[PDB]
Design a protein around this nucleic acid. Structure first.
Ligand code: BLS
Ligand code: MG
Ligand code: MG
Ligand code: MG
Ligand code: MG
Ligand code: MG
Ligand code: MG
Ligand code: MG
Ligand code: MG
Ligand code: MG
Ligand code: MG
Ligand code: MG
Ligand code: MG
Ligand code: MG
Ligand code: MG
Ligand code: MG
Ligand code: MG
Ligand code: MG
Ligand code: MG
Ligand code: MG
Ligand code: MG
Ligand code: MG
Ligand code: MG
Ligand code: MG
Ligand code: MG
Ligand code: MG
Ligand code: MG
Ligand code: MG
Ligand code: MG
Ligand code: MG
Ligand code: MG
Ligand code: MG
Ligand code: MG
Ligand code: MG
Ligand code: MG
Ligand code: MG
Ligand code: MG
Ligand code: MG
Ligand code: MG
Ligand code: MG
Ligand code: MG
Ligand code: MG
Ligand code: MG
Ligand code: MG
Ligand code: MG
Ligand code: MG
Ligand code: MG
Ligand code: MG
Ligand code: MG
Ligand code: MG
Ligand code: MG
Ligand code: MG
Ligand code: MG
Ligand code: MG
Ligand code: MG
Ligand code: MG
Ligand code: MG
Ligand code: MG
Ligand code: MG
Ligand code: MG
Ligand code: MG
Ligand code: MG
Lengths: 210, 206, 60
RNA sequence: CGCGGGGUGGAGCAGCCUGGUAGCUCGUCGGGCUCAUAACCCGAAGGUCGUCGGUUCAAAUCCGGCCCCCGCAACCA
RNA sequence: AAAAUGUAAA
RNA sequence: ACGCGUUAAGCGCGCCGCCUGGGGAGUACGGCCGCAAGGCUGAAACUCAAAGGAAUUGACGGGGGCCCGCACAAGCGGUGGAGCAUGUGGUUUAAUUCGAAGCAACGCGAAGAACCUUACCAGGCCUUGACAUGCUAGGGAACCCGGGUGAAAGCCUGGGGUGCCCCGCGAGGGGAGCCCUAGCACAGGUGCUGCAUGGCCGUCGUCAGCUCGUGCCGUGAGGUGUUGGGUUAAGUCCCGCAACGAGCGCAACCCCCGCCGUUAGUUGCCAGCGGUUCGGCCGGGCACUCUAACGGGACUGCCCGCGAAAGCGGGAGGAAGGAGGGGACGACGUCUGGUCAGCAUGGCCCUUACGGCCUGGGCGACACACGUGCUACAAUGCCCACUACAAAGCGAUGCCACCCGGCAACGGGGAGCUAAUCGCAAAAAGGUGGGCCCAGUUCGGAUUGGGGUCUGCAACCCGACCCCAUGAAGCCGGAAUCGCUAGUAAUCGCGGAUCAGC
């Protein structure tokens, strides 16, 4: 659903949603850093190189919107508008202000000579100003949690090494170290992910049963 | 790598066939692979003596193995025992009536397949690989050759990224087929790894 | 399966078709002559040492 | 509500008046060049024209209404 | 008197 | 060091200015000046393990000069388009075994994948084993035999062969080569690592280069020689020289091909003859072709011209002339090149299993893409017959002239040959009459149908030929690209290596 396929090779960057059963737990362990030592394709004399990548698989997020506000808390406010207007403005409370109590946002509309139109214009600007505003809280968390997760700098970033000139993949966190590799590099990922999951759980019980 | 074997080169221009015998079409391969197994046995029990050359020739069944050594007090054995028991092991695994034909080297430091074997164990026993050459040629040249060259290859007592170095003195016109020369491998088989000692003596363009 | 197949290319078969060539000296299967019972290299190799009768380098 | 504007192969533009007429530029995929990439040369791929319903024998097109996008007055003494 | 570039390990 | 050298950067002295690692910085701050633009004076924090000066060695240049390469030019024939062949990517799948990656991976290791080969796959089995030295041993006894299960391998299973040192009155002799049966050393690995290696190759490149010795120059890395003039395919020479020589290379010596002869005189040969019985068959003869050893032949050796020398440029005669053409032959080195899977080899691993065996599948898969390649579009061509002309090779496993069966491949009958004797044997183009008349064709021969031969235990996957129906795309190929300078390209045929068969 998003991809930057940078000249050669790759994919400089790729996003994709995986749909099915148990998609989380069977890839929720991949998030982190992936060191790789081989002689790159970009190379002109037999030198090995320690490049790397950042896996960041985040779960599914269901999202929300009640059919808008609680008019029971809402504080409406009529008052004489401020400015130039004379007898049908100094003498006509055409200005509105509305206040959402449990959140805290206040908006007002001395925007137009009506009142009903300023009323609604307030009650849909404050539509955005509450939900379109809270969507920041969504992204802020998304962004921050992906950043801690993905891990920034590289090569020193642990988790899993893929050594090609010896054909040995090692996962650091639970310490598998099988010199199979490539088969996983074909797709056979399991002679690897299953070890960590048991290992992950082995100490899971040692938490409130310890 | 490109330089070709100096023997197979003059194979019929100077040096001779180690095997000197005629054969029929469906019998060549039979009394070959049998007859090659002889030098397999001979090298197993004559390195201790100086096996530089074998001349395995054949009559009708009748073989005539003639060996060339350093100082054949080895094949002498207890008076005449190894000369016996070898011919007693020669025919013993053929079916064919063999012979105790044996002869020796005039001067040793003038035989490549010999000169090498000295070195490739001299260093298989650790010794200074450089000066084991510069003096090796120097023995050969004080042994009145016309030229000499020695080659080792692989981990020289160390150096993981292994090297191939050499020293040589005198004349060594390989590309000239006229020249009588001499070549023989030898295998350095040390703890850390295995090398390979080549050797060349130019004896005189006959 | 190394040795277990040079020893089983020499053993008596189950048919006249499971019969096949094996380099007696090296152990090849492809590029093994009938004339020598040899592989292209063992042929090549020993030849240079004159240990193969009458065969000199060709030139014509 | 009210006036008027444009929605069309992934991006950006013609084709609407005058009713049968998918155009250009990138971009894309696939062939070359080059040690390699771009540049560059050579072929192809790709949209029921916002959307309901409309009139004609047919709708990019003529035609009414919400769905969008966009300038858009609303003077309120 | 034509034409850009080559990351990061001896 | 480069260089300076009475026009000092020499040897001396007097006096001023200035420097004390790179960046930060000629900045910031303060002061001074200026219309402004700016100028003068001029720090530090931080930061790095260097910045820099000359000089040597190479590499590199969209620098020069001088040569060369089928490099371009000149010319002829291709691929890129089609269909098939085979190879690789991809994808794929139970696996689709591994490795090769720009020239220098891609009809590559494969010079023979149905089983085999076989490393892959699935499922049946194996546990001191398929193989090697051995050990204690329940006991043996070469072993011909023989049975039920199952796809086989294997689990089980019933028969004694009653032999084998040396003497058992004897009723046990004990041992023994192999052997069965347990157990201790075990083997076994195509498992990883060519970036731990040997060996062998590939390549720039058969390029004309690389160096060493002493001497000499230079504080030194280093230079000199190897540079320069001519010259050649060439570090090939000749001259010249602070050089004199030396090694590795090029040439050269070696092999086919061209000329000539000595020799050899069948199983080949046939000019003359008897022949004649229709004739190289008989006698006949090595004279010629043939075969295969030993040889000569060319040396700028001869002449006009040019240079001092090397050498060059022309014809002369000669089969051949400045290297006559062709092969083999790959310098110190480079590429962290290829190969642990041919093999060897230090490590690391696997040990009722990565090892060991058989059955079947797969290595031949097809939404796709490039390599090498066969076959074509046709009239210089396609078809039917008559019909000549080769050459290197192959085989008493076999090569199969022959009659027979036939539409055929083939089949059954066999005569020779251990092969200069007898076979594979028609070499195709070509030649000669017919034949077609310009069309998706009597081109082209893909695709598929029905029926057959052949070899294997057996052609579903998955074989190669034979016969009849089927007769596709293709009407000369975009961009681009490829081979090749004389018996060469082009085009036609034939043989062999691996090989049951292909
Ligand atoms: C305001 N003026 C001058 C006009 C008159 N003399 C003064 C005046 O106040 N006129 C304003 C008075 C009311 C008028 N007005 C407003 C709303 C309404 N619904 N109807 C109206 O007539 O808009 C007028 C307008 O702008 O001329 C200028 N700016 N020149
Ligand atoms: Mg990126
Ligand atoms: Mg789902
Ligand atoms: Mg206001
Ligand atoms: Mg307003
Ligand atoms: Mg979150
Ligand atoms: Mg590797
Ligand atoms: Mg580790
Ligand atoms: Mg010596
Ligand atoms: Mg196996
Ligand atoms: Mg428009
Ligand atoms: Mg138009
Ligand atoms: Mg590159
Ligand atoms: Mg373009
Ligand atoms: Mg209208
Ligand atoms: Mg220009
Ligand atoms: Mg320009
Ligand atoms: Mg002067
Ligand atoms: Mg100053
Ligand atoms: Mg100062
Ligand atoms: Mg400083
Ligand atoms: Mg500065
Ligand atoms: Mg200050
Ligand atoms: Mg001022
Ligand atoms: Mg210089
Ligand atoms: Mg010029
Ligand atoms: Mg010049
Ligand atoms: Mg000139
Ligand atoms: Mg070219
Ligand atoms: Mg043409
Ligand atoms: Mg491998
Ligand atoms: Mg492969
Ligand atoms: Mg057993
Ligand atoms: Mg007795
Ligand atoms: Mg007894
Ligand atoms: Mg008795
Ligand atoms: Mg390594
Ligand atoms: Mg060089
Ligand atoms: Mg010079
Ligand atoms: Mg000079
Ligand atoms: Mg000089
Ligand atoms: Mg010169
Ligand atoms: Mg010289
Ligand atoms: Mg006679
Ligand atoms: Mg005569
Ligand atoms: Mg005569
Ligand atoms: Mg000559
Ligand atoms: Mg001369
Ligand atoms: Mg002369
Ligand atoms: Mg003259
Ligand atoms: Mg002439
Ligand atoms: Mg081994
Ligand atoms: Mg098993
Ligand atoms: Mg097996
Ligand atoms: Mg035509
Ligand atoms: Mg026959
Ligand atoms: Mg014979
Ligand atoms: Mg005619
Ligand atoms: Mg047609
Ligand atoms: Mg078939
Ligand atoms: Mg053409
Ligand atoms: Mg044949």
């Amino acid at each position: 659903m998003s991809a930057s396929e940078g000249e050669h090779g790759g994919y400089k960057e790729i996003i994709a949603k995986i749909s099915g059963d148990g998609v989380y737990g069977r890839l929720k362990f991949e998030s982190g850093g992936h060191r790789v030592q081989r002689v790159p394709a970009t190379e002109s004399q037999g030198r090995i190189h320690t490049s790397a990548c950042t896996v960041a698989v985040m779960p599914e997020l269901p999202d929300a919107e009640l059919p808008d506000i609680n008019p029971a808390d809402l504080r409406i406010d009529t008052f004489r508008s401020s400015g130039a207007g004379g007898q049908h403005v100094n003498t006509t409370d055409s200005a509105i202000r509305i206040t959402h109590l449990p959140t805290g946002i206040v908006v007002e509309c001395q925007d137009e000579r009506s009142q009903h139109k300023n009323k609604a214009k307030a009650l849909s600007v404050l539509g955005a100003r509450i939900h379109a505003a809270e969507m920041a809280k969504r992204q802020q968390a998304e962004a921050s949690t992906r950043r801690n997760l993905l891990g920034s700098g590289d090569r020193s970033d642990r988790n899993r090494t893929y050594n090609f000139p010896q054909g040995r993949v090692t996962d650091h966190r639970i310490n598998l170290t099988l010199y199979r590799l490539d088969e996983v590099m074909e797709g056979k990922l399991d002679m690897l992910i299953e070890p960590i999951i048991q290992e992950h759980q082995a100490d899971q019980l040692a938490a409130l049963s310890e | 790598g490109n330089k070709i074997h100096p023997i197979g080169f003059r194979l019929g221009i100077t040096r001779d066939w180690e095997s000197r015998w005629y054969a029929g079409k469906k019998q060549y391969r039979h009394l070959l692979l049998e007859d090659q197994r002889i030098r397999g046995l001979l090298e197993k029990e004559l390195y201790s003596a100086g096996l530089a050359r074998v001349d395995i020739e054949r009559a009708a069944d009748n073989v005539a193995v003639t060996v060339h050594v350093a100082k054949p007090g080895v094949v002498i054995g207890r008076g005449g025992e190894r000369i016996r028991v070898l011919r007693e092991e020669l025919a013993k695994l053929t079916g064919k009536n063999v012979a105790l034909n044996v002869q020796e080297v005039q001067n040793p430091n003038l035989s490549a397949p010999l000169v090498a074997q000295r070195v490739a164990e001299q260093i298989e026993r650790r010794f200074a690989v450089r000066r084991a050459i510069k003096q090796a040629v120097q023995r050969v040249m004080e042994s009145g050759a016309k030229g000499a060259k020695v080659i080792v290859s692989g981990r020289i007592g160390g150096a993981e990224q292994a090297r191939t170095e050499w020293a040589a003195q005198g004349r060594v016109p390989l590309h000239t087929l006229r020249a009588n020369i001499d070549y023989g491998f030898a295998l350095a088989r040390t703890t850390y790894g295995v090398l390979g000692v080549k050797a060349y003596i130019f004896l005189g363009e006959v | 399966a190394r040795k277990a197949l040079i020893e089983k290319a020499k053993r008596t078969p189950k048919f006249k078709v499971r019969a096949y060539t094996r380099c007696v000296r090296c152990g090849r299967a492809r590029s093994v002559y009938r004339f020598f019972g040899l592989c292209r290299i063992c042929l090549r190799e020993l030849a240079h040492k004159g240990q193969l009768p009458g065969v000199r380098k060709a030139s014509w």
